[PDB]
């Protein structure tokens, strides 16, 4: 009720392709207790599509969720934040400008740095509304996370875009101006150009994610002064659900049972989602955002949220945001809940034949597949989406 003008999301969505399997049924054919995907990595079912289905087709599905004709004339950027490129030089950002019929004078890119990228547009939206409070600007997480039929990381697949839209007044999550963020160059997770899975050190991974929290956090607290306590939640980039588990557990150790107890309990309700999808890489932190505030039932306005998002490479960031009066009006809920029950259950083989399935984009080609905004054409490696 006084103060600087807020900013931050507005509106926030999810998209995942129509068709998952269950990690049981992926188990039983890789041979493996079942409890290793359950417990161990701690995921249920695995988002998986089809050649005809791309980034922008999740990103134009994410979007169109949330976008009225107003905020269309207001956006005055969009940017797209991704590791799974399909050019090297044109941003997907501008074919989604086109689809999602936004005004022409706006600024169109794509950021590129592991997981990170959306969280970087997400700050970057945030100082231009700032600046510019009557316009709004569209960031969107998009990703294809695969490793391989019968590979190490199969288990952690994933696929899907989070849109959100970033506005002076914002309905939802007002971010505030705390930001701490981290640059290291090592080596845990990277792709060269000319590779379709990425190369990875497992164990440099999982050291490197789990103390850049710790470095991000304990710098914030010098800054800031604030502690757990002063958190009512806390959402976590993961790439998979027990390894955001693990980062966290080792950072608040020296808390109070209550302190513990309360965080662990806000933790599971935020990877509510992730547990039925997979990795959305950008979209991941982002995601445990929405199923944080659609599966809690005791978070309030005026609660503060802390985010943590990395990427590997690496790069991370820790920001907070507070609660909305109003915010629970304003999410989707049912609709994600429908998207998520609506899809259709592969077995192993159909499974591992839409997985198997290439997109040659040298070739002219139609594709034909029932989803708004999936791939109808290649002609001259220039794709069409159906709309």
């Given at each position: 009720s006084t103060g600087s003008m807020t900013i931050g999301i507005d509106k926030i969505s999810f998209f995942v392709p129509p068709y998952y399997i269950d990690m049981t049924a992926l188990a039983e054919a890789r041979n493996v207790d079942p409890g290793k995907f359950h417990?161990?990595?701690?995921?249920?079912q695995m988002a998986v599509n089809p050649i005809s289905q791309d980034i922008v087709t999740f990103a134009a599905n994410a979007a169109e969720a949330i976008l009225t004709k107003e905020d269309k004339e207001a956006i005055d950027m969009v940017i797209v934040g991704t590791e799974?490129?399909?050019?090297?030089?044109?941003?997907?950002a501008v074919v989604l400008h086109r689809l999602m019929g936004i005004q022409p004078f706006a600024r169109s890119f794509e950021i590129k740095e592991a997981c990170y990228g959306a969280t970087a547009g997400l700050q970057l939206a945030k100082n231009h509304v700032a600046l510019h409070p009557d316009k709004k600007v569209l960031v969107v997480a998009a990703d294809i996370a695969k490793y391989g039929?019968?590979?190490?990381?199969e288990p952690t697949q994933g696929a899907g875009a989070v849109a959100m839209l970033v506005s002076?007044?914002?309905?939802?999550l007002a971010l505030k101006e705390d930001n701490v963020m981290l640059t290291q160059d090592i080596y845990d997770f990277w792709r060269p150009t000319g590779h379709p899975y990425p190369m990875v050190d497992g164990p440099l991974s999982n050291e490197t994610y789990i103390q850049s929290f710790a470095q991000v956090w304990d710098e914030h607290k010098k800054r800031t002064?604030?502690?757990?306590?002063?958190?009512d939640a806390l959402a976590f980039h993961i790439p998979y659900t027990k390894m955001g588990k693990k980062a966290l557990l080792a950072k608040i150790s020296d808390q109070t049972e209550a302190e513990q107890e309360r965080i662990l309990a806000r933790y599971e309700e935020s990877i509510i989602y992730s547990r039925r999808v997979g990795?959305?890489?950008?979209?991941s932190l982002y995601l445990g955002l929405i199923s944080l505030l659609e599966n809690a039932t005791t978070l309030t306005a005026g609660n503060q949220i802390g985010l943590f998002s990395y990427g590997s490479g690496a790069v991370a960031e820790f920001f907070t945001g507070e609660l909305v009066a109003?915010?629970?009006?304003?999410?989707?809920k049912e609709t994600h809940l429908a998207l998520l029950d609506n899809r259709t259950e592969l077995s192993i083989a159909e499974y591992e034949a839409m997985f198997a399935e290439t997109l040659d984009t040298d070739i002219d080609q139609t594709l034909e597949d029932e989803?708004?905004?999936?791939?109808s054409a290649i002609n001259n490696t220039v794709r069409s989406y159906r709309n």
């Open positions: 417990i161990g990595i701690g995921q249920d799974s490129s399909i050019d090297e030089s044109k941003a997907a039929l019968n590979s190490g990381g002076s007044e914002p309905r939802i002064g604030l502690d757990f306590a002063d958190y990795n959305l890489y950008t979209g109003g915010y629970q009006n304003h999410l989707q989803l708004k905004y999936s791939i």
